[PDB]
Structure of Fructose-6-phosphate aldolase 1:
Amino acid sequence: MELYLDTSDVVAVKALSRIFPLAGVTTNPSIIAAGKKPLDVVLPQLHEAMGGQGRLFAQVMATTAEGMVNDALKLRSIIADIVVKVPVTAEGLAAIKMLKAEGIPTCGTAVYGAAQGLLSALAGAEYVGPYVNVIDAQGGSGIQTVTDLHQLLKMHAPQAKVCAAGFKTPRQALDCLLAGCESITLPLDVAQQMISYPAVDAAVAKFEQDWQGAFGRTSI
Amino acid sequence: MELYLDTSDVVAVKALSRIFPLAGVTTNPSIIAAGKKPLDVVLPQLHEAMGGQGRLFAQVMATTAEGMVNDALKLRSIIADIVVKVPVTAEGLAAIKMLKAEGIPTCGTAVYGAAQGLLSALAGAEYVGPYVNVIDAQGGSGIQTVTDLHQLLKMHAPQAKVCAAGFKTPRQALDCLLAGCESITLPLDVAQQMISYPAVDAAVAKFEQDWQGAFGRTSI
Amino acid sequence: MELYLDTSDVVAVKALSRIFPLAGVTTNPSIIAAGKKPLDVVLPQLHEAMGGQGRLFAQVMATTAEGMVNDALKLRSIIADIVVKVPVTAEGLAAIKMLKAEGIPTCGTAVYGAAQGLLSALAGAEYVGPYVNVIDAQGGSGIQTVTDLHQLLKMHAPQAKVCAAGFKTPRQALDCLLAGCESITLPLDVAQQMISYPAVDAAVAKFEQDWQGAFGRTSI
Amino acid sequence: MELYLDTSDVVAVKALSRIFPLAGVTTNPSIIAAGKKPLDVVLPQLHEAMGGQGRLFAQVMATTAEGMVNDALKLRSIIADIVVKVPVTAEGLAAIKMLKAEGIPTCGTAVYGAAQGLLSALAGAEYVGPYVNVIDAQGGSGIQTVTDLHQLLKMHAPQAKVCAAGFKTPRQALDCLLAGCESITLPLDVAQQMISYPAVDAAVAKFEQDWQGAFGRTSI
Amino acid sequence: MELYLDTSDVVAVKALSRIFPLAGVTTNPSIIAAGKKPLDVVLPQLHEAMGGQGRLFAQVMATTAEGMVNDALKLRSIIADIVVKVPVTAEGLAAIKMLKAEGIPTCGTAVYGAAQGLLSALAGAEYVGPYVNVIDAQGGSGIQTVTDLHQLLKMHAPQAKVCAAGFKTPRQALDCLLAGCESITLPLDVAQQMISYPAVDAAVAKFEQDWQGAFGRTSI
Amino acid sequence: MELYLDTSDVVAVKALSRIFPLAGVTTNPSIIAAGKKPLDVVLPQLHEAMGGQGRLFAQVMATTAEGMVNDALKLRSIIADIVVKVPVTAEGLAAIKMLKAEGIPTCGTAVYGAAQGLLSALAGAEYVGPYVNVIDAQGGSGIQTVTDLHQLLKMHAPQAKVCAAGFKTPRQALDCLLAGCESITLPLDVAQQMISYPAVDAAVAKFEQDWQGAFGRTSI
Amino acid sequence: MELYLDTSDVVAVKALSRIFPLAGVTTNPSIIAAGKKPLDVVLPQLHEAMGGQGRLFAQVMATTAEGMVNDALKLRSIIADIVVKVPVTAEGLAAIKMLKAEGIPTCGTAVYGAAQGLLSALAGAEYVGPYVNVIDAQGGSGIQTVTDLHQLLKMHAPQAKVCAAGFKTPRQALDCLLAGCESITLPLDVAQQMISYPAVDAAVAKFEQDWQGAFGRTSI
Amino acid sequence: MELYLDTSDVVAVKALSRIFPLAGVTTNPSIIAAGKKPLDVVLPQLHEAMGGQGRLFAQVMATTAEGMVNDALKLRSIIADIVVKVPVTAEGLAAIKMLKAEGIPTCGTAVYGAAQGLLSALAGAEYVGPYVNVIDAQGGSGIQTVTDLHQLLKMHAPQAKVCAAGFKTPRQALDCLLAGCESITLPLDVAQQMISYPAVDAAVAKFEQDWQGAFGRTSI
Amino acid sequence: MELYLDTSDVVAVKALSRIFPLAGVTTNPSIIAAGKKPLDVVLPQLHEAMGGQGRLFAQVMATTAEGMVNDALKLRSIIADIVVKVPVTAEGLAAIKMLKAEGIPTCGTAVYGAAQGLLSALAGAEYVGPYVNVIDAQGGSGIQTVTDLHQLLKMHAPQAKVCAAGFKTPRQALDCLLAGCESITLPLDVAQQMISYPAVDAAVAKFEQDWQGAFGRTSI
């Protein structure tokens, strides 16, 4: 499974890169705007924070398919192996098709339904990104949409993967993973929650207390 | 998965060919009549609109099996690699058998039950076309019939595929695809509905608004 | 069960009132605009077309809760026993609360999720109308949302009913009814489709043919 | 449960009335034509065969709703307590409504879908008759349609009952009964099959053989 | 739940009457033949062995319905409150109907299918007896038949009960009871197996051993 | 999937051989007796009707295993590649074992339970034939028995196939096929029913009507 | 729900009586032996520890049914309202029957199967005690046996309750309660585990810490 | 699937070897004692009865692991390819381990739980024998235990098989086989019941009767 | 499947090594403290007790990731092929990553959720050890967490295994194994319970009694 980070925070990415088995860092225009720095500056910094390896995601700005292709070329110039993000629209689907014809990896973002994600995957997208929280806030079920999308990708576009995003709680990520999602991207808060357990600290303290009682020291 | 268009509209087929990953265009005598132009004039136009590639479907008009074979030969003369469509009747099954013996690819159309579609597939048809809307309007369940037909084809005629048609809503197409259908043909209204999401437009607008707020421009 | 018509066509309502066991006619601002006539003119006409009985639904146009209440009072003045419709918003929920305090029956329209419909029902709404086709076109599942809403209403607001709307096919209405919906409103096309079966005509013709063969007469 | 006979055979009805707990005899124009005698002659004969009790069903022949009501009045004149049968069409639904207004029991025949049967039941029909064999031969599932219709009647029209017909095997009748159908009508072949078991005869013969072995006689 | 004994063994019936909460004793011609004594001699003995209470079952031996009625009258003369047993045949169903008209309780024996048992129950039988062992030995499933019969009786003939018989193992009786059967009749071997557990004896021995260890005695 | 015909009607077999994708013709002593001609006369005629290809089934008539083997040798002499049919009895199982040792393909007929069919398959039978209608008329469930038998053959005798027979309706055949049966044999009535749909004829008529309206002719 | 304690520890019973909503205290000969004091001494002490209320359980020690009845009379003399415990054996069932006839409340202990517990309940026992841990250690499933016993008691002996015992973990008690058990008896260790949660202590500490931070005190 | 016989009856084994596709003969100390002859005499006789082929099972009698290994060596001396049987105890598990180290095939008998059977299989046993009847008589479910054991063996010890024993009815064997058991051992009564069907005899008689009616003879 | 022992008792490990098919011995700081001897002394003793083979587990004691790596190196120095254990924390995950980079096998202990275990497995852990009892004593479900963790490992980290720990009853271990866990570690009490069955002893005694009755001796 590929575990990505949904942030542009370089310091946090560096801090969590040595803890998590991160497969990359994933960004969207809102995240970049929150970062306040441009792509040509952020993307090298995020790549360095991951140790020079990993896989970066960036989203296009244009609305026309040709503009999306030009933005994809710019992103590939900034980062050689970047994976574009492209909203799944009519122009988005056209741009995905052109990028597939051009050999540039593409990702179908702004996916709200299983059929839309499947269309993006068939167009040539390597990843299809549904936002669980946005779909849940749209009155639907993000987990059900993600499960349907994963089933469709596996049975119809086996070369495509689902990169579920938009998690408010670690339970959402667990549910998405149990649905079979081949990839997942977590925000900093959710990612930190996934590893912070007070029960683990209590158990470690109890182990150390028993060690002191039986030996009188803490090491070894 | 093969995604076809259930239309004879050349302009719309050309417009949607660059958006959708179309595997071809599918037609029936009613669609052709609505197009008001003959097969020898439409089929070349539909093939050109698809970019010179793809897989066209045309339906025979004869009632006798020998007449159906003659119509299939005429269609193959018009388009070299066309896939005939043949109603699944006694004469239809006979014609499917003869076409299989002749190497011409055939498609079992006018399928109202899973067993009828399985008979068409066993006769030699590569595709079996159940009309979801017609079956639903016949008092039955189009999705259940399509699921049964797909299961029967997969476990009895693995070389045959289900090309579900007759969709009034994108949800019907999604349900058919989740049932495992190897192919699907959408009408123009349904196909357009599959890619038009106001929520996607709103999300893109929000992304651009954040981009402007944080940088003051729209591109890159 | 209450069967309503989602139309403002007075002639069609009159024609279908003697066929269907209609409980009333349901209208929304788009339907009224398509009707091209004002509420003070349409509503008496629709009531008369129903035979002077039944239950009419009309939707408020104000955005503020107090304006919503004023529009509700105007509608009640036009039709004594009309059931208002109110979009389920913050101001919509406030207006529903005031109308409940005022004894005016209210309906929660523009419902996109089960929880929103439950909030409308708890505020005091007698009906909660989710549009199945709109929710389906929003990337979700209209039938699943309707089922969840009905379950919530039955186990939490037993005095409220679900009036499922927005049907493209009779199968959607059948699925909603099988989910337990206490009410359903159909457009003219879907309502007509539910009663027109060619198989029934063929069976009646066969019965008459057998009657002629055995008796040589058509009547009795 | 109400057990009816789908026949106009007076001798067979008399023979099976003393065996089965028959609730009535059910007829359709094809059955009457096979009988070769008119309603004014058959219906008194069928009523007498049942012992002067039971509940007879006869089907109207008119196409217009007013003609349907006239035929219903004629049938009621022939048999005082007869239950009409009326195909579920637009004119059929209108005639059902008029008969309900007139206090004449009505039955919705020629039912091909659950929604059509529910419409007939809501119009005022006490019984809704789906033909399992006809629906099965129409490419659908008769048992599934009957189950859906029964669920709809129970949860929406509790005063209506399902009288499943068109059985080729006793297993179909068993499946319909297990679905909860409140009534069932069997043809003579199926009805006779339901009670004829060679295993029962063998077991009785074995019991008599043991009785002879232990006692030497057959009686008592 | 009514617990009966499928035997004519007077000594064993007396022995097990004080252990089991028996509702009566059930017999068939084979069991009586194995007993080697006539009904007029056995039935009083079986009634006395039960303490003068309980409900006895005896089976008719005639083949014609009138003969079955005469045998039922003879049995009622022998035992005032006996419950007849009548094979579910055409003549058996006729005899059940006559006995119901005569007020004599009847039981539908020789039941091999759920529908046959339902017919017997509708005819007027208070109990319906399927033999689990015989149905299992006939290639079918005795437990499934019993479950279907119980469901049919509960939803169609609520006044009738299922008295499952023909058990080779206590697990069969447990499965029948878990299916909801209102009554059950066990043979001597199965009935004895239901109460003989070596584990219970071992646990009692352990309890007594602990009592001796802590106190030094066995009583109190 | 192998589709056989359960008949000895040479003319009907010839008529349906060019329509259906028949794998052969299947016969039993009752069918042959209805044909009124001997095996040495029928079997060559049935083979010729099938076009000189296909796979014929004939049933032995002896009661002893050695007699069954002799009858199998006689049948193989009449038709070189015939598949014997052998009732699954003790002598039947012995004969199946001897035929397997002799290299003659064998078929286990007269199968009433899943265990009996599995025993026949293990003995060496290539096909196991359960009669759905006979099992259904025996009080059990033919479809359940067929499903259990197919499961057992698949997990225990993978070299054996289930050839379901005894169909009264096409729905039974569809249910058997959906259970996974590798083979099916249909009678003439059921087989003809599977391909005759009035809806298909109506749809073809509508297609021709649209063709005439838009073009003014019927061909091409 | 009745919550009992499976112990004879008077001090612990008194300590836990003010914490738990105990319905009584339950004992068996092994527990009493571990207590090292006789029934005439323990039972008054246990009753006093519960505050003079509640319902005590004691087990007979005789093997013969008459001896069991005598022990039950002795126990009732010691404690007026005690609920006896009686192993479900042949003599145990006889003793249960006599106690039911005598008006003494009885409990079926040493229950290893659902059928044995149902027999005890039908004999007249008000409670049936399956030992979950003993059944689990016997190779079976204690939770499944308890669920089956509860279903049987509810559908056959509605006046009887299941008092599940023999718990090693609180999860076993939770599973038994979720199965519908009307009563449960916990050992001291399991009962203490049910209320001791370190997470609750941590949450309370956090609440008090926030209270101190925001106000600077601990009370109110 | 491997079909064994649970007997030491040489004459019955010889009689049933030519009917059943027996894979061997299985024995236990109780069966041998019923045979009244020693292993050195019975085992050669049973091997000869099977035709010199098949796979024999014999059970050790020692209580210590070393004595168990000595008994296994003695059994292997008597029969070269015998499959030992070893109760799954602590010493039994030790003996299974030693026999696996020694290359002697071993079988885990006296299995009462899925975990015990899995332990035996992991120790090295090729077969694991649970007695369905004994487990059922122990208050548990033999079929559930067998299913759990088979699942555990398949997912944890794929080289081990389940040889279900202790059948009172053929339905138990059918249930075990449907659970996927790779082997089964039947007693003579159950084995004979599995092949004796009166319905098959009746069907054969009907076939011969039709043959006589149409031809006038019995052969061919 | 790998069966480990969750103990540091050298004598018990030696005793149970010849009975169980142990794959190793698992230890934690609390277990080691209970052992009262250091790792450099216990680990050689535990390895010797297993016969010089097996796979030992030891847990690090440091809190920092670098200290965890140093402790892992010390453990590997003590035992060449030891499998470390590392609590799944942020520092624990970092240490797991470094150990994977260093080629040292690692185990993710102190796992309280499926997602935490999956993170440990992705970081590089060969095993993931959730404590069933510790999770159950935290208000959750240990079996459900173990099942979710195993599913996640199989579908996302196929190279990792689940080593379920913390069992109070053999039923917990059976449930974990039925969930598919590739490994399991048992405490001495639970391990002993899995092999000690009084029923097996009774069956062996009965076998020996029959042997004496039929032969008069105990051996062979």
Notes: The two ends of chain I are 34 Å apart (CA to CA).
